[PDB]
């Protein structure tokens, strides 16, 4: 059943979303504001960008055929991240963080 497969994978997400995982969580909730960071080479090194909100969209627009597809935007996220940034970018071990969070809970799912 892929409504099964898909209220396991909006679990999946308000959980990445959850209190607990705030702390580390918190840059990935929505997409990256490049104007107000002052990333402006970010849209020409990340070509297809995403964050928590954008599948959040997704999940309740019932856009994603299989819980494959909703993986990988999530992998996504955190792909873009550990392209654009530095490997010790503090941001880069938050996304590590979250991906442990993911990883986990997507594989027992
Ligand atoms: C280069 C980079 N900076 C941010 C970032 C986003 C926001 N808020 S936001 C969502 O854009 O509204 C605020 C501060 C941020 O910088 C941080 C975040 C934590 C630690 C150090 C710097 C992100 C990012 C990515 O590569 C992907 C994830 C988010």
Redesign the pocket.
Same mark, same amino acid.
């Given at each position: 059943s892929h409504m099964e497969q898909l209220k396991c994978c909006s679990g999946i997400l308000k959980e990445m979303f959850a209190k607990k995982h705030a702390a580390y969580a918190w @840059?990935? !909730?929505? @997409?990256?504001?490049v104007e107000?960071?002052g990333?402006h080479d970010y849209c020409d090194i990340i070509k297809h960008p995403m964050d928590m909100s954008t599948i959040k969209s997704k999940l309740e627009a019932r856009e994603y055929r299989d819980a494959q597809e909703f993986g990988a935007d999530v992998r996504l996220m955190f792909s *873009?991240?550990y392209k !654009? *940034?530095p490997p010790d970018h503090?941001?880069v071990a938050?996304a590590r963080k979250l991906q442990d969070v993911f990883e986990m809970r997507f594989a027992k799912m």
């Open positions: @840059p990935f !909730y929505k @997409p990256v504001d107000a960071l990333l *873009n991240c !654009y *940034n503090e941001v938050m």
